[PDB]
């Protein structure tokens, strides 16, 4: 009963934890190994601010909306425990600003105190005439990854630093079930023409007087290509870069200047904030998450593959409803094989 | 035309600035001196978190409500300037939690996005069943005092470190108008049986993941004797001590334990927050602010006194409507004396 999880981002770690907590007793010799090229300080998950916010549109897969809601409910129930800070979990309120009166989100009742912005609030942001105010949650990738790692270490999950070349290489080592949580790099193991990098560039700035997130929206320039300010525990994340199909894992001045100019206009107090760091990340963009079973009859033995990737810019927002669904798929592998 | 302001807290400094900005041209040789025992890092103003919040009750003096509103409007208009951080000025949202359904405040429309808490929000705080959520402003005393000082230094206002024994001592030095902004210590210069210390004890804790203020209310134990959490730029203020008539300028373990136990129950994540400092302050409590003219015919020459003290736990919330009213009273001294 050997299980290999490929990837140590929020997807891989949360899935490994979910499978363990649901099947560690059910199956007595349950072996779980985590195979990843990049761990905990250097994944895409570490680059994310961690704000819980799904896309404004209804998902292509109606299950995704339920997956997001399940994660918010799981996270909100732990927000007040004396542990919540080890997870990098905290409540935060803020603004979603629009150029016109768009419909309310599907998640309007999932979040706390959702409402329409008043004219006195809209007066504070001179280029926007519509908006929302609500209270959401930030789950910082860096801390959450460290937390999931500790939980996995105490549960006997063994971690391995390696770049996997094919699923066959893994199957040959004697892994019955393979959990593929490769993120943006999932194409390298099995070509997927629906998966593409959603290049983002962000600035981490010291502005501790910023207590609210501010996300702006423009249908013209599209999703995440508009300014955003997301306060974290130690720093403030400045962003607004979204370049589909760009694999440049390097910061660039044009993107820097665009984030700076755009964020300073939104919040002019930022002109005196110190820049601590700047980073680049690839959102694993797909029309919908690939979370399904596949048979590797093309390779060694029977050997089933659980795909779990393509979380775009909403990986942290959705991860828990995903890990649970993957844990449900893992159970179906046990019952179908006549292994009750 | 010599003017002496006694006090370098928010009251004295904001009044000195207001008189200067309104009468520096009107009167060509306008001499302004600031006399204070304790300056900028050590006043009661430095101990205040700086949240804009008047009392839940309608003021005894209906002008006080207009004075608070004038300060919020003045501060909100400067919240977004690239300077706002030199002032220690920032927007903040949060909770006011009650044991029962009390009426809406007088200031419900002064604040941003004021609303009643929903049942899902009230579920987060197990001992409270009613509440409000709104967006207010924090004006940090420490930074604001440094700002007013710089503004006064560039305007030629001369500062003097001394303990004034009587108004007569000041009148004898040749001061025509005396502005008395002595705060809680105003009784020492002229007995005032309405003015009393509102002893408060606070903890400054490192909890940067706290993005909202939380103020609790109990009619049983009274005003500010209930837990409160107020995040600042660099630290989180923990409080809930209000002892009328207690002059103990010393922290005590009973008050410490009361703030700790009460705040940790409100927000259990605080159990792992580091204590950076603890302080004691005396709110200058009076049934209403004394902001009026008095003739010192009892002392040297004619010599008018402008009283400006007794701002309780709402000094920063009200200071600007006060400084403006004092500046208006100073003008009445010029026109009555047949000095047009
Ligand atoms: C700038 C930016 C901001 C974002 N902000 C938010 C946000 O506020 N909220 C939110 O909900 N989401 C956000 N996201 C999205 C979030 O970061 C992702 O959806 C989530 O981190 C992706 O998780 P993952 O586990 O799919 O990928 P990753 O974090 O990339 O991890 C994939 C893992 O698989 C590994 N791997 C890949 N190929 C192999 C191989 N052959 N062998 C071994 N290992 C392999 C990598 O080494 C890595 O460990 C943001 C993204 C970016 C870039
Ligand atoms: C624990 C606590 C928390 C608070 N939180 C808030 C809040 O969140 N929001 C809010 O709006 N308000 C708050 N307050 C209230 C606020 O601190 C006061 O109302 C305001 O600071 C008082 O201002 P002042 O200028 O009257 O007094 P002070 O800051 O005390 O200054 C009085 C000045 O007069 C001087 N002085 C006195 N006597 C003499 C003399 N004989 N000669 C020379 N100088 C003299 C002192 O040296 C000092 O410089 C809080 C108070 C406390 C104690
Ligand atoms: O760049 C991003 O910013 C966000 C802000 C809030 C919620 C999700 C995201 C995803 C992004 O890619
Ligand atoms: O202790 C105090 O806490 C406050 C919180 C908000 C607004 C005013 C006050 C005044 C206090 O004295």
From Swiss-Prot, chains A, B:
Subcellular location: Peroxisome matrix; Cytoplasm, Cytosol; Presynaptic active zone; Secreted
Complex and partners: Homodimer. Interacts with DAOA; the interaction is direct, can occur in the presence or absence of FAD or substrate bound to DAO, and results in a complex containing two DAO homodimers and 2 DAOA monomers. Interacts with BSN (via coiled region); the interaction is direct and inhibits DAO enzyme activity.
Keywords: Amyotrophic lateral sclerosis, Cell projection, Cytoplasm, Disease variant, FAD, Flavoprotein, Neurodegeneration, Oxidoreductase, Peroxisome, Phosphoprotein, S-nitrosylation, Schizophrenia, Secreted, Synapse
Stretches the record annotates as Required for protein stability: 1-16
pH-activity dependence text: Optimum pH is 9.5-10.
Reaction(s) catalysed by this chain's protein: a D-alpha-amino acid + O2 + H2O = a 2-oxocarboxylate + H2O2 + NH4(+); D-alanine + O2 + H2O = pyruvate + H2O2 + NH4(+); D-cysteine + O2 + H2O = 2-oxo-3-sulfanylpropanoate + H2O2 + NH4(+); D-dopa + O2 + H2O = 3-(3,4-dihydroxyphenyl)pyruvate + H2O2 + NH4(+)
A Pfam family recorded for this sequence: DAO
Tissue expression profile of the protein: Expressed in the cerebellum, in astrocytes of the cortex, in motor neurons and fibers of the lumbar spinal cord (at protein level). Expressed in goblet cells of the small intestine (at protein level). Increased in the cerebellum of schizophrenic patients (at protein level). Decreased in motor neurons of the spinal cord of patients with amyotrophic lateral sclerosis (at protein level). Expressed in the cerebellum, spinal cord, kidney, and thalamus. Abundant in glia of the cerebellum and predominantly neuronal in the dorsolateral prefrontal cortex, hippocampus and substantia nigra.
Temperature-related behavior of activity: Optimum temperature is 45 degrees Celsius.
GO cellular component, one term: peroxisomal matrix
List of residues binding FAD: 8-11, 37-38, 43-45, 49-51, 163-164, 182, 283, 312-313, 315-317
Name of the protein: D-amino-acid oxidase
Effect on the protein upon substituting residue 121 to K: Found in a patient with ALS; abolishes activity; impairs FAD binding; over 900-fold decreased affinity for D-alanine; over 200-fold decreased affinity for D-serine; leads to the formation of protein aggregates; increases the occurrence of cell death
UniProt keyword annotation of Ion transport present: no
Domain of life: Eukaryota
Effect of residue 31 to H: Increases affinity for the FAD cofactor and D-serine. Decreases the cellular ratio of D-serine to L-serine
Keyword Protein biosynthesis: no
GO biological process: D-alanine catabolic process; D-amino acid catabolic process; D-serine catabolic process; D-serine metabolic process; digestion; dopamine biosynthetic process; L-leucine metabolic process; neutrophil-mediated killing of gram-negative bacterium
Free-text activity regulation comment from the record: Inhibited by benzoate, crotonate, thiolactomycin, chlorpromazine (CPZ), risperidone, haloperidol, sulpiride, aripiprazole, blonanserin, quetiapine, 4H-furo[3,2-b]pyrrole-5-carboxylic acid, and the substrate analog CF3-D-ala (3,3,3-trifluoro-D-alanine). Inhibited by luvadaxistat, and 6-chloro-1,2-benzisoxazol-3(2H)-one (CBIO).
EC number from the UniProt entry: 1.4.3.3
């Amino acid at each position: 009963m050997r299980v290999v999880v490929i990837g140590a981002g929020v997807i891989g770690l949360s899935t490994a934890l979910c499978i363990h907590e649901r099947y560690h007793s059910v199956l007595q010799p349950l072996d779980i190994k985590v195979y990843a090229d990049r761990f905990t300080p250097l994944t895409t998950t570490d680059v994310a601010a961690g704000l819980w916010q799904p896309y404004l549109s209804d998902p292509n897969n109606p299950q995704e909306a339920d997956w997001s809601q399940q994660t918010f409910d799981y996270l909100l129930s732990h927000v007040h425990s004396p542990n919540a800070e080890n997870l990098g979990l905290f409540l935060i309120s803020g603004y979603n600003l629009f150029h016109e009166a768009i419909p309310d989100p599907s998640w309007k009742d999932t979040v706390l105190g959702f409402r329409k912005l008043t004219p006195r609030e809209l007066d504070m942001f001179p280029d926007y005439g519509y908006g929302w105010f609500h209270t959401s949650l930030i789950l910082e990738g860096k801390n959450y990854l460290q937390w999931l790692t500790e939980r996995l270490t105490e549960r006997g999950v063994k971690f391995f630093q390696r770049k996997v070349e094919s699923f066959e290489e893994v199957a040959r080592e004697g892994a019955d079930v393979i959990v593929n949580c490769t993120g943006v790099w999932a194409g390298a193991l099995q070509r997927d023409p629906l998966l593409q990098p959603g290049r983002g560039q962000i600035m981490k700035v010291d502005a501790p007087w910023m207590k609210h997130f501010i996300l702006t929206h423009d249908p013209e320039r599209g999703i995440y290509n508009s300014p955003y300010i997301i306060p974290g525990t130690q720093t403030v994340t400045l962003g607004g870069i979204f370049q589909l199909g760009n694999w440049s894992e390097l910061n660039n001045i044009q993107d820097h200047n665009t984030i700076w100019e755009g964020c300073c206009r939104l919040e002019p107090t930022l002109k005196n904030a110190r820049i601590i760091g700047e980073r680049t990340g690839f959102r694993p963009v797909r029309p919908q998450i690939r979370l399904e079973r596949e048979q590797l009859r093309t390779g060694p033995s029977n050997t089933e593959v659980i795909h779990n990737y393509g979380h775009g810019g909403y990986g942290l927002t959705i991860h828990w409803g995903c890990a649970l669904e993957a844990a449900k798929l893992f159970g179906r592998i046990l019952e179908e094989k006549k292994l009750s």
